[PDB]
Amino acid sequence: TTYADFIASGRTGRRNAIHD
Amino acid sequence: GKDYYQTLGLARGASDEEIKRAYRRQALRYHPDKNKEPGAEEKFKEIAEAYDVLSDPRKREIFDRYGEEVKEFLAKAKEDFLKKWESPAQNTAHLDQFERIKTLGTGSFGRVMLVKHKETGNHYAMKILDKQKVVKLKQIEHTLNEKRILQAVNFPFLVKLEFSFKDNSNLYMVMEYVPGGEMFSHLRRIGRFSEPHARFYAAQIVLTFEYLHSLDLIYRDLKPENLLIDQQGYIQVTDFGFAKRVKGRTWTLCGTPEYLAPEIILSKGYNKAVDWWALGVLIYEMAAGYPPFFADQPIQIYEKIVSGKVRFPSHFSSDLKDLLRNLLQVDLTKRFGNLKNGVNDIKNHKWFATTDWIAIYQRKVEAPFIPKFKGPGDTSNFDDYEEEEIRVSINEKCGKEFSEF
Ligand SMILES: NCCNC(=O)C1=CN(c2ncnc3[nH]ccc23)CCS1
């Protein structure tokens, strides 16, 4: 569900990491 | 994995007449004519299963044997880890020895490059990190843990750290060069992994997490970007930037938003259970082709995660949804891998009953997908990157905060 929403989210490429 | 003695509630090496006494006891507790709570019926068959084995003296023989062997494998693994843990490898090479070819990927830490050692003639993969982008993060710590841990661990699915050294501008980690590409690229290209396809990958992670947890190590950054496919089509975990050795609870907020377990997002502390949460996300993203929790921006991903409302696609078997429902559990007293039966709850799940655990470890199962090997040192299962030359300054930067390397 919402695969086209996944593409619209802009978070489909290699995701960077949080480090806090 | 099955733990027959715990089902009956007895110590190993109990007397066969206490095995009989234990069985008739637990059998009365979960009897269908006596207890009707929905879980009792399957603990009843599991109590019968434990007795069928422990009373047949030749089957208690095979089971007691496979157990001491596990005890020795865990004790020899732990032995290997601690000696290399406290006696780590340093300055085992120098950049002059390696000829740089192609950038295989680029990350916030630094670059990973295909290199050929000139003497040995072998190909390796070098991770270059700039001490000046990392002394700023204040996560010198996370990169020190990555060196100490990667040297000192051994498993068919962890990548092997052959050489490590440092110069004035950077730190270097040379590693076995996995050529099949990142799972990330394959998954995105296809869009989806088939359920049997995902199960294969999932199983090696359960085995790796079992290993790594047995050593009191949390891995803390499971994602397809961090999983590489070797030539036998199997999995090489390749990024340990966030792995820490932990007793009790730890508190750093780190890893990758989509894969952060709820308890990390909340100021509450956390432990190895977060890697089991991540596995559920990993299985989900492989089967669906998208993670269970996205949004334009991390804060709204954190919000979707803590809600614990998941939606599954129309495909997705019933056992898949039951497994993720147990992995993606906000309740730490209900999430598989954290319960009394530990990894067995995952190993013995209905979505896995078709998977030969030992054959996975010995890599004797045929892999649902083998990459096209094009000859030693091909880089075409990797994307092409803009090549930035290595600069070393006249002066050694951050010589102190990276004393241990
Ligand atoms: N999110 C950061 C995690 N990414 C990585 O570690 C990468 C490693 N790459 C490797 N390619 C081939 N062989 C290899 N051996 C060890 C690493 C390695 C590809 C580039 S990205």
Pair B265, B257: CB distance under 8 Å: no
Pick from B56, B75, B101: which residue ends a domain? Answer: B56
Helix pair angle (B16-29, B40-54), 10° resolution: 170
Has residue B80 been placed in a domain?
no
User: Quick one: how far is CA B248 from the chain centroid?
Assistant: 19
Q: DSSP letter at B367? A: P
Q: Are residues B402 and B329 in the same domain?
A: no
Rg (CA), chain A: 11
Pair B209, B216: CB distance under 8 Å: no
A18·B257 Cβ contact <8 A: yes
Has residue B81 been placed in a domain?
no
* CA–CA dist B97, B103 (Å, integer): 17
Angle at B293 between CA B287 and CA B294, to 5 degrees: 105
CA distances, B229 to each of B193, B194, B264 (Å): 14, 16, 29
| Biggest alpha carbon–alpha carbon distance for chain B | 82
Of B262, B220, B263, the residue nearest B244 (C-alpha): B220
Which residue does chain B place closest to A9, by CA atoms?
Answer: B296
Centre of ligand 1 to C-alpha B112, Å, is 6
- Testing the interface with B: which of A2, A3, A6, A11 to mutate, by most B Cβ within 10 A? A11
Q: Are residues B260 and B140 in the same domain?
A: no
Angle at B354 between CA B349 and CA B355, to 5 degrees: 85
Centre of ligand 1 to C-alpha B37, Å, is 49
Has residue B68 been placed in a domain?
no
Tokens of B395: 């002066």
Q: Resolution of the coordinates in A? A: 2.7
Of B249, B102, B262, the residue nearest B181 (C-alpha): B102
The strand ranges marked E within B167-290 are: 170-176, 217-218, 227-229, 235-237, 244-245
Q: Are residues B241 and B347 in the same domain?
A: yes
Tell me the residue range of the domain where B392 lies.
88-180+372-405
The domain spanning residue B165 has which CATH number? 3.30.200.20
Q: Is A4 on the interface with B (CB under 8 A)?
A: no
* B141 contacts: CB under 8 Å, gap ≥ 6: none
Of B258, B266, B330, the residue nearest B296 (C-alpha): B258
* CA–CA dist B387, B76 (Å, integer): 43
Backbone angles phi and psi of B230, in degrees to 5: -85, -175
Has residue B306 been placed in a domain?
yes
Rg (CA), chain B: 23
Has residue B132 been placed in a domain?
yes
Q: Are residues B26 and B95 in the same domain?
A: no
Nearest CB partner across the interface for B256, out of A3, A6, A17: A17
| Biggest alpha carbon–alpha carbon distance for chain A | 31
Q: Are residues B378 and B304 in the same domain?
A: no
Q: Are residues B94 and B232 in the same domain?
A: no
Has residue B78 been placed in a domain?
no
Backbone angles phi and psi of B103, in degrees to 5: -80, 120
Tokens of B189: 């290209």
Q: Are residues B299 and B350 in the same domain?
A: yes
User: Does any ligand 1 atom lie closer than 6 A to the CB of residue B112?
Assistant: yes
Experimental approach was: X-ray
Has residue B63 been placed in a domain?
no
Residues of B serving a catalytic function are 221
Q: Are residues B108 and B3 in the same domain?
A: no
Q: Are residues B264 and B354 in the same domain?
A: yes
Pair B302, B296: CB distance under 8 Å: no
The domain spanning residue B21 has which CATH number? 1.10.287.110
Q: How many CB atoms lie within 10 A of CB B16?
A: 11
Q: Are residues B132 and B118 in the same domain?
A: yes
Total of domains in chain B: 3
Has residue B232 been placed in a domain?
yes
Q: Are residues B172 and B190 in the same domain?
A: no
Q: Are residues B40 and B52 in the same domain?
A: yes
The domain spanning residue B226 has which CATH number? 1.10.510.10
